[PDB]
Design an enzyme around this catalytic site. Sequence first.
Site, PDB file in Angstrom:
ATOM      1  N   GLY I  59       0.410  -0.919  -0.521  1.00  0.00           N
ATOM      2  CA  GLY I  59       0.185   0.601  -0.278  1.00  0.00           C
ATOM      3  C   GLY I  59       0.840   1.915   0.547  1.00  0.00           C
ATOM      4  O   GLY I  59       2.065   1.316  -0.446  1.00  0.00           O
ATOM      5  N   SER I  88       5.752  -5.144  -0.463  1.00  0.00           N
ATOM      6  CA  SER I  88       6.224  -4.058  -0.163  1.00  0.00           C
ATOM      7  C   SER I  88       5.543  -3.419   1.102  1.00  0.00           C
ATOM      8  O   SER I  88       6.478  -4.561   2.150  1.00  0.00           O
ATOM      9  CB  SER I  88       4.672  -3.305  -1.275  1.00  0.00           C
ATOM     10  OG  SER I  88       5.228  -1.984  -1.778  1.00  0.00           O
ATOM     11  N   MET I  89       4.896  -2.063   1.684  1.00  0.00           N
ATOM     12  CA  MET I  89       5.247  -1.656   2.934  1.00  0.00           C
ATOM     13  C   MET I  89       4.566  -3.263   3.704  1.00  0.00           C
ATOM     14  O   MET I  89       4.936  -2.852   5.256  1.00  0.00           O
ATOM     15  CB  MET I  89       3.954  -0.555   2.554  1.00  0.00           C
ATOM     16  CG  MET I  89       4.365   1.063   2.530  1.00  0.00           C
ATOM     17  SD  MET I  89       6.281   1.024   3.360  1.00  0.00           S
ATOM     18  CE  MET I  89       5.439   0.835   5.095  1.00  0.00           C
ATOM     19  N   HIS I 113      10.571  -4.720  -2.601  1.00  0.00           N
ATOM     20  CA  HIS I 113      10.708  -3.720  -3.802  1.00  0.00           C
ATOM     21  C   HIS I 113      10.664  -1.741  -3.362  1.00  0.00           C
ATOM     22  O   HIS I 113      10.005  -1.648  -2.544  1.00  0.00           O
ATOM     23  CB  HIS I 113       9.470  -4.075  -5.178  1.00  0.00           C
ATOM     24  CG  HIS I 113       8.284  -4.017  -4.882  1.00  0.00           C
ATOM     25  ND1 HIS I 113       7.766  -3.422  -5.678  1.00  0.00           N
ATOM     26  CD2 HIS I 113       7.628  -4.014  -3.558  1.00  0.00           C
ATOM     27  CE1 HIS I 113       5.941  -3.238  -5.959  1.00  0.00           C
ATOM     28  NE2 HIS I 113       5.690  -3.200  -4.078  1.00  0.00           N
ATOM     29  N   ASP I 162      10.653  -6.758  -8.267  1.00  0.00           N
ATOM     30  CA  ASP I 162       9.989  -7.144  -7.157  1.00  0.00           C
ATOM     31  C   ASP I 162      10.943  -8.719  -6.945  1.00  0.00           C
ATOM     32  O   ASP I 162      11.860  -9.484  -7.964  1.00  0.00           O
ATOM     33  CB  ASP I 162       9.235  -8.061  -8.058  1.00  0.00           C
ATOM     34  CG  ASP I 162       8.153  -7.706  -7.903  1.00  0.00           C
ATOM     35  OD1 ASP I 162       7.934  -5.214  -8.139  1.00  0.00           O
ATOM     36  OD2 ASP I 162       6.757  -7.816  -8.574  1.00  0.00           O
TER      37      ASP I 162
HETATM   38  B1  LIG Z   1       3.958  -1.108  -1.728  1.00  0.00           B
HETATM   39  O1  LIG Z   1       3.784  -1.746  -3.412  1.00  0.00           O
HETATM   40  O2  LIG Z   1       3.370  -1.394  -0.798  1.00  0.00           O
HETATM   41  C1  LIG Z   1       4.644  -0.150  -1.838  1.00  0.00           C
HETATM   42  C2  LIG Z   1       5.476   0.105  -0.410  1.00  0.00           C
HETATM   43  C3  LIG Z   1       7.357   0.555  -0.585  1.00  0.00           C
HETATM   44  C4  LIG Z   1       8.028  -0.428   0.607  1.00  0.00           C
HETATM   45  C5  LIG Z   1       7.796  -0.127  -1.931  1.00  0.00           C
HETATM   46  N1  LIG Z   1       4.241   1.276  -2.289  1.00  0.00           N
HETATM   47  C6  LIG Z   1       4.763   2.743  -3.439  1.00  0.00           C
HETATM   48  O3  LIG Z   1       5.378   2.546  -3.293  1.00  0.00           O
HETATM   49  C7  LIG Z   1       3.414   3.300  -2.981  1.00  0.00           C
HETATM   50  C8  LIG Z   1       2.361   2.342  -3.976  1.00  0.00           C
HETATM   51  C9  LIG Z   1       0.367   3.759  -4.745  1.00  0.00           C
HETATM   52  C10 LIG Z   1      -0.145   3.242  -3.520  1.00  0.00           C
HETATM   53  C11 LIG Z   1      -1.459   3.275  -3.706  1.00  0.00           C
HETATM   54  C12 LIG Z   1      -1.719   4.209  -4.151  1.00  0.00           C
HETATM   55  C13 LIG Z   1      -0.433   5.619  -4.671  1.00  0.00           C
HETATM   56  C14 LIG Z   1       0.337   4.268  -4.517  1.00  0.00           C
HETATM   57  N2  LIG Z   1       3.352   4.444  -3.508  1.00  0.00           N
HETATM   58  C15 LIG Z   1       3.624   5.547  -2.752  1.00  0.00           C
HETATM   59  O4  LIG Z   1       3.036   5.150  -1.275  1.00  0.00           O
HETATM   60  C16 LIG Z   1       4.320   6.970  -2.414  1.00  0.00           C
HETATM   61  C17 LIG Z   1       3.686   7.673  -3.587  1.00  0.00           C
HETATM   62  N3  LIG Z   1       4.127   9.180  -4.171  1.00  0.00           N
HETATM   63  C18 LIG Z   1       5.122   9.810  -3.295  1.00  0.00           C
HETATM   64  C19 LIG Z   1       4.623   9.320  -2.452  1.00  0.00           C
HETATM   65  N4  LIG Z   1       4.266   8.032  -1.848  1.00  0.00           N
END
Ligand SMILES: *[B]([O])([O])[C]([C][C]([C])[C])[N]C(=O)[C]([C]C1=[C][C]=[C][C]=[C]1)[N]C(=O)C1=[C]N=[C][C]=N1
Lengths: 195, 183, 184, 189, 195, 184, 189, 183, 192
Positions: I59, I88-89, I113, I162
């Site tokens: 997310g 991810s998160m 990733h 990934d």
């Molecule tokens: B992952 O896919 O969960 C990842 C987390 C990180 C550990 C690599 N998420 C992101 O990179 C998110 C993805 C996203 C999810 C929902 C709506 C939009 C984007 N990106 C961001 O949180 C982000 C985007 N722009 C500026 C700052 N942060």
Amino acid sequence: MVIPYVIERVYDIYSRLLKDRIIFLGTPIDAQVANVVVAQLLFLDAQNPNQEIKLYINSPGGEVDAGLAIYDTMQFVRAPVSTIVIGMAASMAAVILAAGEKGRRYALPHAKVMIHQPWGGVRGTASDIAIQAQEILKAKKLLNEILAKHTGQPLEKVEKDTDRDYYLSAQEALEYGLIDQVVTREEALEHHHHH
Amino acid sequence: VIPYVIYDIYSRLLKDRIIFLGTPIDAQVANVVVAQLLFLDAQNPNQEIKLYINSPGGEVDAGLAIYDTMQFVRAPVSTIVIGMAASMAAVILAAGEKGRRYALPHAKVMIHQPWGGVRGTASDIAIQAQEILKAKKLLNEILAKHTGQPLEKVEKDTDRDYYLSAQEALEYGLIDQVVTREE
Amino acid sequence: VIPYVIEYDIYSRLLKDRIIFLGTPIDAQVANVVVAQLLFLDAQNPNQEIKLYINSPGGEVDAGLAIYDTMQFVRAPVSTIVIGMAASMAAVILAAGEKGRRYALPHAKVMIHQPWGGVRGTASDIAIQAQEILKAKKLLNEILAKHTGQPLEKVEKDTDRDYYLSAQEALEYGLIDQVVTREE
Amino acid sequence: VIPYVIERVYDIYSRLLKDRIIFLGTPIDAQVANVVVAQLLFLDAQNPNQEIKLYINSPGGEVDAGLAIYDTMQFVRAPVSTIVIGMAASMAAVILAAGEKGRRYALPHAKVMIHQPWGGVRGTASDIAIQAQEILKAKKLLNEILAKHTGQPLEKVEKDTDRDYYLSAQEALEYGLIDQVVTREEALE
Amino acid sequence: MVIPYVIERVYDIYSRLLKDRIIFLGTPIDAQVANVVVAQLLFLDAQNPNQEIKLYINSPGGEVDAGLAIYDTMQFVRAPVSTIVIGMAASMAAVILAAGEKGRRYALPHAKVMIHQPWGGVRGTASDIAIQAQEILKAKKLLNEILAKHTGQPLEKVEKDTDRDYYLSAQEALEYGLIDQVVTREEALEHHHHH
Amino acid sequence: VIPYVIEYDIYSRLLKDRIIFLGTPIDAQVANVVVAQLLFLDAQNPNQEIKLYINSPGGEVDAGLAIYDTMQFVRAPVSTIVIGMAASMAAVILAAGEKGRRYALPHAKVMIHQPWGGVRGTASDIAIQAQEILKAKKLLNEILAKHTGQPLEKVEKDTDRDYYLSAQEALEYGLIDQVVTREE
Amino acid sequence: VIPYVIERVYDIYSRLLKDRIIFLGTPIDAQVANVVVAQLLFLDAQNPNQEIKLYINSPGGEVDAGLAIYDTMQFVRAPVSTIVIGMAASMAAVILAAGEKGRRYALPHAKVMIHQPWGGVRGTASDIAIQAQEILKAKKLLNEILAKHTGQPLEKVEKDTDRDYYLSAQEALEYGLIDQVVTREEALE
Amino acid sequence: VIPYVIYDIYSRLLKDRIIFLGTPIDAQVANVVVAQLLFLDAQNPNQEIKLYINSPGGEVDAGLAIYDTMQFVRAPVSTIVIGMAASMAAVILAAGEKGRRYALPHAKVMIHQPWGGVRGTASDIAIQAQEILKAKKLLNEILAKHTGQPLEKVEKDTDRDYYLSAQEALEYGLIDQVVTREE
Amino acid sequence: IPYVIRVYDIYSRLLKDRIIFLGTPIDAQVANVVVAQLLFLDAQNPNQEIKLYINSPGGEVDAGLAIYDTMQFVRAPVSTIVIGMAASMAAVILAAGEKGRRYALPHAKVMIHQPWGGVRGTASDIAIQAQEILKAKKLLNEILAKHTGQPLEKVEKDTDRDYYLSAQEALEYGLIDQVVTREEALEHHHHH
Ligand SMILES: *[B]([O])([O])[C]([C][C]([C])[C])[N]C(=O)[C]([C]C1=[C][C]=[C][C]=[C]1)[N]C(=O)C1=[C]N=[C][C]=N1
Ligand SMILES: *[B]([O])([O])[C]([C][C]([C])[C])[N]C(=O)[C]([C]C1=[C][C]=[C][C]=[C]1)[N]C(=O)C1=[C]N=[C][C]=N1
Ligand SMILES: *[B]([O])([O])[C]([C][C]([C])[C])[N]C(=O)[C]([C]C1=[C][C]=[C][C]=[C]1)[N]C(=O)C1=[C]N=[C][C]=N1
Ligand SMILES: *[B]([O])([O])[C]([C][C]([C])[C])[N]C(=O)[C]([C]C1=[C][C]=[C][C]=[C]1)[N]C(=O)C1=[C]N=[C][C]=N1
Ligand SMILES: *[B]([O])([O])[C]([C][C]([C])[C])[N]C(=O)[C]([C]C1=[C][C]=[C][C]=[C]1)[N]C(=O)C1=[C]N=[C][C]=N1
Ligand SMILES: *[B]([O])([O])[C]([C][C]([C])[C])[N]C(=O)[C]([C]C1=[C][C]=[C][C]=[C]1)[N]C(=O)C1=[C]N=[C][C]=N1
Ligand SMILES: *[B]([O])([O])[C]([C][C]([C])[C])[N]C(=O)[C]([C]C1=[C][C]=[C][C]=[C]1)[N]C(=O)C1=[C]N=[C][C]=N1
Ligand SMILES: *[B]([O])([O])[C]([C][C]([C])[C])[N]C(=O)[C]([C]C1=[C][C]=[C][C]=[C]1)[N]C(=O)C1=[C]N=[C][C]=N1
Ligand SMILES: *[B]([O])([O])[C]([C][C]([C])[C])[N]C(=O)[C]([C]C1=[C][C]=[C][C]=[C]1)[N]C(=O)C1=[C]N=[C][C]=N1
């Protein structure tokens, strides 16, 4: 609709004013809302056929058949129903207003009444249209007669007046016979002499 | 879609005084049929015009336009129903020059009263209800004239959909010959 | 699907014969193309007649008046012929052909009524647009009275709702001059 | 939004159910037939001798679901008084007419409308033939049910229902659909 | 758009009247229609910079930038352009009408003119809105000035008049200065004495 | 997501404390539920004050007047407090609290203007609906003049377009009585 | 609907092309860049010494497509006079400014607007970094192209284009975007 | 969605005088935050209220409602940004009781000028353009008061999006402590 | 969701037992409700453990960090258990449980990733958000290095695309502490 709650007794705000024999007719009138208004009347009259029911009206009107349901149920039920228009009472909602217990039909100062003839629509073959055309014609005459009865006006006047939209201020509604009092302020509880 | 000759295929059969009424009838197609008639009669008011009919019907006003223009124009118009001629398209079929109204063997005719729709206030509905009633009687009378049937009969027959085979259309008076080969 | 003839499409060929079709509902685009055909036909010969066949349910008053004003202005006399339907502005255009040269086919109709429209805006804005529709109403009632011969108090009461006329009824009302059945 | 009443909080229709009142105020499809049928079954189990009042405001619906309501009224021991407020059309007219004789009521400006069934079929010729036959039986069946409960000759209901046939409440009295046009609450005669 | 054709010479009806130095401005004005009007002017002036061009107007208006394009091109081009409003000339289309060659600006009897200030819309940040707000303000003053020039009216009058929709009959447009003649009937070709 | 408290939801609990929220745009449904809360609070005690917190962009005149008429009619005095925004009919409701008991927070706003609307129909029908909007305009200008103290010729010219007021500017205009910053 | 003129029937834009006139009256995307480029190439092949007039009414468009038009104007031998009628914004301003010096013209009420590029990127962080760098070069590149052709110091175009910068035709003269504000047809001086 | 305790989880933390501002700010969420404050201050005007912030911002008018209500209410409200506090949500963060404005380590603050949109006539646009200009200056001033920064600086910083880490937010004055463990 | 009777829905009853579920993708509203459950469970008893079951594809970084920062801040130790998927998160949240109390079921996965996102605006505006995404990238690489023990250039090169891990592979990487297969037998203990 985020309606609020009140108090081993939990009601929503309209359900609590129902315990005070208040009914709201605040939406356009279709079969569904006619039924629920009719049902509240039947219940309030079963609770006590002699106490009054207050029916607050803010509605632009609706289907004649559903409106008549509300009308017929007000006449039929033993309890007298005082109609009060706050804001707007138009088309069938005007008729319901006018058909409260004579002398207990009230408007607030800036409320309105509007009356006019019915409108509708038919699709089908010529035979089918003829039938529905006749039906709308009866409803027109029927509703003009109901208005004449409850205002006191001569029927050829209501027919002439309702040919297009006829807007009435609350005072004008007094002068027309649709209501009995334009109510502005709530008066004090009053004492009486016992001579 | 449509092929070409050295005209497109319908435009070439127009130089042979053939008109096609192959779509449902609305004002636009009435106008273009009317216009072809007017042109073909101006070219030669004595030669015949063949009007091939494959249509499910349409708006009475547009249909009457086609009808009135056939009667008005000096040239006699032979109507030929191939496949289907229903509602106003049946009326147009029946109103060809008496004796040169033709059906192919498996073509059909269907007749019935008009249908429509009105929105508005009670006053407005009353007016359009009256209008549809005149069209009903008017079209029943036009049918009675051109088939020979008593009017009480067309009124009771057209109360619902009344389907006719080509032979049945012969006996009813809507056409004059069921044509199978090209003599 | 419009058909072609050896040189035109069918409407363009009848234009050579000084025939114009007004067969759609009337909006600015069709007013302009009718106006333009008139201007061209009058430039080609200001004395010959133009036949204007009418099958239309009406349309915008402004576009209709454009057609009307152009018929009066142009030197050539325009005979109007309603086939099928001429309603609202299309009735007005029918009635405004050269007197004596306004024709209906037997089962054609005419319908007349007052204008309709719509406005969205503030109270000041609605007031302005309400006054405009009121002028158009009176203006069109007057145009009808002039070209039929009827007293204006009559067209105003007749056009209050939809007023349908058979071709014969249109002849006795003054909207046309002859109900034409044959080719004469 | 339906209101509530009162160790007992009912909604308004559920409270009038404790008074043996059932509402049929929507168009009739299988879902509403089932819930009406179920209320009848429950009210008859509570007391097979007391009357059930069935208030009717409906434009009609599916014949199969309507018959379900009809068959359940006849089957159940308790007598069901039908009362049309506002509108009772098509299957809803039939349900009105099939209340306990003598206890079928209309309010003054209520209406009844009757007509033959309508429907639709897609499929092959064989398939259409089958459901065409089915609609024909329903037509004949519903005409017969009407004739029984009004007293009219069947040749008359068949002609009358060929198109929409609207009845005022008085006209419904004269036709046999109901027994009393009730204007005021005293029905205690 | 089923526009008709005319005659080794095939034109559509608007293209044939172009050979007679007639241009139609019959649609609402956006960049696309401005360009094609501008292009016809440029061509007609290249054909003959001394003959007149007739510009028939039936339009509700449009974008100021596209309208000004048409305006600037009329002034720039050597040929004088007579504007004729048939039916409707509103907003930018009124301006284009008023900017025909003085003395050759014509209305038909029941045509109209309507004038008012510009309208538009902006989204963005506060800085961005401020910039576009200033732009619309210049266009407002600029168009008021163009109107004052070509009608002869004092500028504080056009500013006051255009604050809301200002509808003019053709006669009223004469009296305001937007046109020069209300033309009703086409006159005969005329003979002249050679003394 | 509204939160709950041990017996209510948060707005229903502040209703026990004779607080009503008018936080949405005003249509008939929200007028009715505000009216109903007033009627109940006045029945519970016609002498205690009712606080009406206002954050609304306005709405339908008819529904707004319903709220207005009910505030005047009811015996209990209703203190209006605008937090954030009170525009159009919501400004009127603000101005019509008990004189001396009409409050704004420091950065709240008031905006006033004439009504807007829309009508579709025939010329006769538009004329009727145009006259109705004209009465509402004059009626609402008069209601504003009465409750602010301003000459009516001034409210009419001020409300011709959107007229935004800071809370201080609202205090000098008469729409409120105190700009409240602390809890006092 | 574009009109026609006349063994030769052109549409109106195609006829003004025989007079070495090109219209850039739409927003600029690759499709319109290509067709403008192609007209230039053809007009220069017909006669590399005669002038080409390029009438401009456009709100701008894609930098890559705009540069295509720009690069083709510089490359082609024939000198291209740019004339803004109505509007020349973003890339369309750049194309205006890059006509043959001394032959860049505005009509009196035409406008010019300039600003930095805008765009959008989706993807992973690595992917965004790459196209962020790309947009940064385009910004710097277009500021430099403007400075060249107006004569202004580059630190000035960079500050001016930070937000939308609208210029009247006179203001465009003073800025260096054009050479003459032309009110009447005589440009034969 | 939300779990229950024997209240739903946010309603239970409300009895601990915790309020969540976790959504974008529109009038509806302003009202419900304002209402919780009013209730918590009526319960006890001296105890602190904790306001957890995770929001991207929202409408200035609704945000100011929350702001004005925090200042007005007697109870001191400690703001804590977890995750994100942007636009109006940054302002609400900065306007907690001085000394009890907290960020978690990886939370962010972002500030910038308002944005919006207007349709209408030139007269109408001029009016709303003026309104947005006041809001811009007004919000710059509110920020300067509560951070201590010179106003010329907040105006130039908020011209575009200005992202702050929690430490950077400390040095800017938007908060008082970057809190990592629960002492 | 089913119910159990005091009455609860099934997730609310396991909350009674200090169990929290993170089973959906992570956006601000689910971060807030997870954060709120932690705050409540720690107020209930700051010394008892909280179990956080994880089945999530990830997310928004900001919402995820909210959950992360709240786990570190709160006094109670939170054991993370990935059932099914933690990506991810959600991988980061898994890795940041109390060291020694981070568990996977046998066929669960972890995926890591770099962040992804999107920006529309002018060049100036894109530059600003591009810089923001770059910080988040490095910030999250550092958080991973801290809690796994891996050298930071390794997490940076591994997360470039990934990177899927089985539960065993997650053990060897440092993201968890035990691959748990059967709930440990309930036994009778000697008390000498
Ligand atoms: B992952 O896919 O969960 C990842 C987390 C990180 C550990 C690599 N998420 C992101 O990179 C998110 C993805 C996203 C999810 C929902 C709506 C939009 C984007 N990106 C961001 O949180 C982000 C985007 N722009 C500026 C700052 N942060
Ligand atoms: B009114 O405007 O509320 C009016 C009541 C009467 C007193 C003049 N109602 C109608 O005319 C309705 C309008 C309508 C509303 C919603 C759906 C469909 C129609 N017409 C009917 O009820 C009606 C009556 N007979 C036939 C068809 N429709
Ligand atoms: B038929 O089905 O084609 C039939 C003609 C028959 C009676 C000789 N046509 C109609 O009844 C048409 C149907 C229709 C077609 C398209 C749109 C709407 C309706 N009806 C009318 O044209 C009509 C006439 N008077 C009033 C209303 N409608
Ligand atoms: B008719 O129905 O064709 C009628 C003309 C009649 C009075 C001679 N036309 C109108 O009333 C038109 C209808 C319309 C067409 C298209 C869009 C909107 C309305 N009305 C107008 O042209 C008009 C003019 N001024 C104000 C509002 N409406
Ligand atoms: B009436 O209009 O309410 C009517 C009842 C009957 C006494 C005349 N209803 C039907 O005829 C229904 C209409 C319908 C409603 C919803 C979906 C489809 C059809 N028809 C049927 O129930 C039916 C019966 N047999 C076959 C197909 N459909
Ligand atoms: B008009 O009503 O034709 C008017 C012209 C002026 C003489 C009063 N046009 C405008 O105000 C247009 C309206 C518009 C039409 C279509 C799309 C968008 C806008 N406004 C503009 O041209 C404009 C000017 N500056 C800024 C934004 N928009
Ligand atoms: B305001 O913008 O809230 C304003 C009230 C002000 C004059 C005191 N309200 C209106 O003008 C409303 C706006 C509206 C709301 C919803 C639907 C349509 C319009 N107008 C009306 O209530 C109205 C009343 N009579 C006729 C037309 N419109
Ligand atoms: B302008 O607004 O016309 C402008 C030109 C530049 C001189 C400031 N155009 C752009 O910035 C375009 C806008 C665009 C149009 C259509 C689709 C997408 C974007 N941007 C680009 O061409 C661009 C360049 N590099 C990367 C992404 N986009
Ligand atoms: B932020 O992005 O949340 C920001 C607050 C910051 C300046 C302290 N909000 C705004 O600028 C809002 C944005 C918005 C949100 C939702 C709908 C529309 C716009 N702007 C306004 O609230 C506003 C204020 N005055 C006039 C117009 N718009």
